[PDB]
Amino acid sequence: NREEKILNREIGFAIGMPVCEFDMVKDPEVQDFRRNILNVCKEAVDLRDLNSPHSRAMYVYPPNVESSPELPKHIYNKLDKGQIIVVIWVIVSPNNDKQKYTLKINHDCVPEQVIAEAIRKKTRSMLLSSEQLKLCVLEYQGKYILKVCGCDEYFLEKYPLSQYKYIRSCIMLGRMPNLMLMAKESLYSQLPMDCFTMPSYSRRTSTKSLWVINSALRIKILCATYVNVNIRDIDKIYVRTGIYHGGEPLCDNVNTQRVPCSNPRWNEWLNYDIYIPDLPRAARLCLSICSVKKEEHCPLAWGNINLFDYTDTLVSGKMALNLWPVPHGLEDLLNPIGVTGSNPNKETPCLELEFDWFSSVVKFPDMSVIEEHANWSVSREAGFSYSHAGLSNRLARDNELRENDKEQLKAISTRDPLSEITEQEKDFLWSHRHYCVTIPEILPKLLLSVKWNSRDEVAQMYCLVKDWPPIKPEQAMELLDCNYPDPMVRGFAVRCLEKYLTDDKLSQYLIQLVQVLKYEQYLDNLLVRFLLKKALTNQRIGHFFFWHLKSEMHNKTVSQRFGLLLESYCRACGMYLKHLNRQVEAMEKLINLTDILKQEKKDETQKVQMKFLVEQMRRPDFMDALQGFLSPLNPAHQLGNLRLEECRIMSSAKRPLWLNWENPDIMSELLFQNNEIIFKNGDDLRQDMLTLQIIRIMENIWQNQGLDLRMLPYGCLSIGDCVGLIEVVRNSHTIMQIQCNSHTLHQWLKDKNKGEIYDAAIDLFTRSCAGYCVATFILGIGDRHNSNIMVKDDGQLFHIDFGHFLDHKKRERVPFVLTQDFLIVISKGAQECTKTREFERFQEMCYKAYLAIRQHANLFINLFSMMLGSGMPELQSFDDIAYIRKTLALDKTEQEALEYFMKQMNDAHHGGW
Numbered sequence: 001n002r003e004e005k006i007l008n009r010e011i012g013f014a015i016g017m018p019v020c021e022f023d024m025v026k027d028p029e030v031q032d033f034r035r036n037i038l039n040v041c042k043e044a045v046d047l048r049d050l051n052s053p054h055s056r057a058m059y060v061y062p063p064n065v066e067s068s069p070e071l072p073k074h075i076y077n078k079l080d081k082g083q084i085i086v087v088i089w090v091i092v093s094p095n096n097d098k099q100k101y102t103l104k105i106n107h108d109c110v111p112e113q114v115i116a117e118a119i120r121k122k123t124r125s126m127l128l129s130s131e132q133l134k135l136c137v138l139e140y141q142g143k144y145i146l147k148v149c150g151c152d153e154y155f156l157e158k159y160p161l162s163q164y165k166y167i168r169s170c171i172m173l174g175r176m177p178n179l180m181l182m183a184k185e186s187l188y189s190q191l192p193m194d195c196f197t198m199p200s201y202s203r204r205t206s207t208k209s210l211w212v213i214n215s216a217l218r219i220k221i222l223c224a225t226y227v228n229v230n231i232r233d234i235d236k237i238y239v240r241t242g243i244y245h246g247g248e249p250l251c252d253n254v255n256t257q258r259v260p261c262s263n264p265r266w267n268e269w270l271n272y273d274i275y276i277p278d279l280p281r282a283a284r285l286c287l288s289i290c291s292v293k294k295e296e297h298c299p300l301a302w303g304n305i306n307l308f309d310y311t312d313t314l315v316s317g318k319m320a321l322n323l324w325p326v327p328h329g330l331e332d333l334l335n336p337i338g339v340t341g342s343n344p345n346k347e348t349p350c351l352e353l354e355f356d357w358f359s360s361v362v363k364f365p366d367m368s369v370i371e372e373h374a375n376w377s378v379s380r381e382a383g384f385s386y387s388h389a390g391l392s393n394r395l396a397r398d399n400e401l402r403e404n405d406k407e408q409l410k411a412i413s414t415r416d417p418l419s420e421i422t423e424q425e426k427d428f429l430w431s432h433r434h435y436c437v438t439i440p441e442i443l444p445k446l447l448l449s450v451k452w453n454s455r456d457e458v459a460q461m462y463c464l465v466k467d468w469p470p471i472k473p474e475q476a477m478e479l480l481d482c483n484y485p486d487p488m489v490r491g492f493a494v495r496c497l498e499k500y501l502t503d504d505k506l507s508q509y510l511i512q513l514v515q516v517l518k519y520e521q522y523l524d525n526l527l528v529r530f531l532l533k534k535a536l537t538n539q540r541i542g543h544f545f546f547w548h549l550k551s552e553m554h555n556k557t558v559s560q561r562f563g564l565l566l567e568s569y570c571r572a573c574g575m576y577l578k579h580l581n582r583q584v585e586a587m588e589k590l591i592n593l594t595d596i597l598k599q600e601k602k603d604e605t606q607k608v609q610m611k612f613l614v615e616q617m618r619r620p621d622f623m624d625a626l627q628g629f630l631s632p633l634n635p636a637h638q639l640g641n642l643r644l645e646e647c648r649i650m651s652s653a654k655r656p657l658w659l660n661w662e663n664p665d666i667m668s669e670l671l672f673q674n675n676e677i678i679f680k681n682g683d684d685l686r687q688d689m690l691t692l693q694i695i696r697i698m699e700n701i702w703q704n705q706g707l708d709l710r711m712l713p714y715g716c717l718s719i720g721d722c723v724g725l726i727e728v729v730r731n732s733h734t735i736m737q738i739q740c741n742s743h744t745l746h747q748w749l750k751d752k753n754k755g756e757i758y759d760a761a762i763d764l765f766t767r768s769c770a771g772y773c774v775a776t777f778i779l780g781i782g783d784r785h786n787s788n789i790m791v792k793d794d795g796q797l798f799h800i801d802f803g804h805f806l807d808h809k810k811r812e813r814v815p816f817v818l819t820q821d822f823l824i825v826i827s828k829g830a831q832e833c834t835k836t837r838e839f840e841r842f843q844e845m846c847y848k849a850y851l852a853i854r855q856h857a858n859l860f861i862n863l864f865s866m867m868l869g870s871g872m873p874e875l876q877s878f879d880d881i882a883y884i885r886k887t888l889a890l891d892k893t894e895q896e897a898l899e900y901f902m903k904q905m906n907d908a909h910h911g912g913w
């Protein structure tokens with residue numbers, strides 16, 4: 001109807017492409033995805049409608065909570081005998097007259113307990129209810145809700161007060177928590193009923209098993225079209241092919257004969273070393289058109305195909321695959337990690353293929369057929385004699401699992417993901433697979449030890465994975481990267497995340513989880529259904545889910561998958577679509593303005609450029625579009641009226657806009673009265689996004705281990721192709737800005753923190769400096785200098801502009817070299833700043849911080865591994881990630897690692913360590 005057409009227009013504006021473009025995609029996988037995904041949409045809407053209005057309020061305003069209620073000892077020691085002082089505000093009279101009520105209560109208090117105490121202090125005024133009616137009709141703890149003053153953050157669930165990230169932050173930073181008491185009905189009325197409507201597309205020979213096909217794999221290469229090249233630069237061309245399971249070949253590569261580029265017609269049946277029943281479920285045909293002019297081979301275009309379609313059917317008949325351009329840094333002739341499926345641009349090289357025909361629809365076997373076969377294999381193997389078992393190292397006799405074997409398996413499991421498992425160890429792991437069930441964490445290594453080109457082994461692995469004990473969400477995440485293409489394996493990983501991944505951790509790891517969707521074979525899978533359900537049942541997850549997917553819509557490798565996924569999100573997210581559309585339009589106006597300043601007005605004064613900007617922004621359509629919406633950096637932050645006098649074009653290349661909005665919140669003064677965001681169009685912000693995530697994780701590790709090293713992982717969000725937002729840090733200046741001699745910085749902090757507050761400032765400087773020193777050395781971050789190092793007024797040091805990481809200077813560098821300026825502050829003025837107790841203490845923070853990250857090395861290795869899928873230049877292979885194996889000295893021992901870290905610091909600083 002009329003309502004549907006309007007919804008399609010809204011969805012089209014949000015995703016940046018019209019819905020009709022999907023309707024004309026004839027691929028049944030695309031159409032089946034659009035229809036079948038609506039199950040998740042329905043399920044999510046039903047959970048939100050379950051406890052209306054409360055459950056709808058929990059979707060819109062989910063509790064911003066820490067994963068564990070348990071508090072670290074040093075954070076508990078900041079409290080006054082485990083008690084927190086909280087200020088509770090009440091707006092009385094419509095002239096918004098504010099009334100504060102300071103409460104001293106236990107940190108573990110639940111919001112309703114906090115509301116009751118505030119009522120008691122309010123009742124202390126009309127002290128007639130001291131004894132008589134002391135209860136005050138339950139003291140209406142369920143008629144009110146607590147809100148964070150200055151932003152749209154609510155305390156709707158029964159968590160201990162300290163578990164809310166705001167209060168934990170207030171405790172850690174020694175800040176007074178300011179909460180606003182609000183009526184429940186006042187919040188519920190704001191929330192509309194999102195009555196989800198199903199779209200109009202919801203309304204829309206013989207079969208033989210794969211294993212009953214006694215035949216080797218053959219694939220016919222017919223010809224290519226749109227092969228437009230130089231026959232001066234090229235002598236002859238051929239099609240290179242291979243059969244892969246992830247990035248691992250399942251047999252040797254097969255090439256066609258050489259043909260001139262003038263007539264690319266092979267019509268050749270390529271014969272592969274693989275029995276059709278031994279084809280694993282995630283088996284793919286990887287191909288490329290190459291040129292040869294010793295001789296020099298070179299890929300022209302590449303393409304990957306799943307040998308089984310989304311319905312478990314083995315590919316048959318004729319097929320045409322539109323190829324992709326070679327990405328720079330392609331070492332092999334084939335690109336097996338690359339995207340599977342046809343290039344959406346049909347004006348690209350197009351190879352015509354033909355698969356075998358068996359006079360019937362060949363389907364991958366049912367789990368009952370796999371279980372029957374696995375039980376057959378296990379029982380047959382159990383029956384093998386001493387001599388028979390002797391014929392293979394992949395066959396082990398029972399009563400031949402010594403305490404040495406068990407301890408060797410445990411030692412192999414502790415090894416990092418980037419550690420090579422030798423063929424000897426692979427046979428060993430596989431032969432002892434049943435013992436491996438008792439060490440659940442060994443699963444990634446056992447899975448890499450399986451012969452994926454053997455149905456007998458894979459069928460048994462399937463049964464082991466089915467009854468495999470649960471592993472930690474962080475351990476499970478590794479099983480979703482490019483090394484693990486099997487759907488049974490990935491399904492187990494998703495099931496671990498479903499059971500053990502909290503909303504806090506899902507938000508923290510959302511960038512990785514969105515990335516690994518790209519390594520899925522099909523549009524409809526367990527992972528996407530897990531992510532979409534969570535996005536549609538938690539608006540804080542949904543917000544970033546949308547922006548992460550929207551930011552990569554310009555990439556044609558993921559545009560269809562992300563487009564279709566975004567469409568399903570927008571159809572079911574509810575009222576938030578209209579709020580996202582405000583953000584989308586505000587960003588579009590900013591992209592369009594910044595493009596005009598880079599193109600049209602590049603060669604103009606800042607004064608002149610600002611004159612154009614102010615004139616253009618003050619147009620009624622622009623002015624409205626650019627004010628009165630939610631911050632894409634943090635949607636709890638409302639961006640009110642634009643303070644044009646506070647806005648400015650920054651004197652940097654890319655011409656970033658320093659933007660300022662009023663905070664329209666009633667109690668904006670208690671948090672921040674103005675929201676300052678940097679809009680940058682020109683720079684790829686994905687590397688900074690990853691570094692900022694990692695920095696936050698590193699900080700969390702140190703804080704839990706009782707190491708108070710304060711970091712500053714400021715907000716950074718990529719919203720498109722080299723476009724995004726950066727959070728401004730209030731009251732901070734670069735080392736260059738301070739410099740107005742070596743004592744300049746120390747004197748500046750003395751001036752900013754005189755008297756009894758001086759010692760706290762030096763301590764905060766040293767602790768933050770120690771954290772950044774260790775973080776930057778491990779991650780191989782871009783060279784530090786006076787303009788990319790910043791210091792807050794309170795003494796908090798932090799870094800900006802990461803840009804590059806790891807082995808970017810292509811022999812392990814120290815990005816943050818502590819000049820005498822930093823050392824003088826550390827040593828409280830002392831000239832001999834190396835030979836001081838303050839420096840010795842600072843070194844011990846660096847050593848403890850270094851080793852703490854060494855302890856969590858598999859996490860960081862895994863987080864980087866899951867990000868190989870994104871087209872980041874600095875993160876293109878597992879050898880790039882191997883930089884953190886060097887900086888962390890993983891092969892070396894803990895004491896040898898400290899000696900390594902010390903040596904690097906000693907050489908960089910020219911003594912001291």
Ligand SMILES: CC(C)n1nc(-c2ccc3oc(N)nc3c2)c2c(Cl)nc(N)nc21
Pocket residue numbers: 678688714716726727728729730731732733800801802803
């Ligand atoms: C040059 C100066 C005005 N400045 N520049 C950035 C900045 C600008 C772009 C950035 O890009 C990245 N990745 N970090 C950045 C940091 C920045 C921040 Cl966050 N906070 C404050 N208080 N001042 C800042």
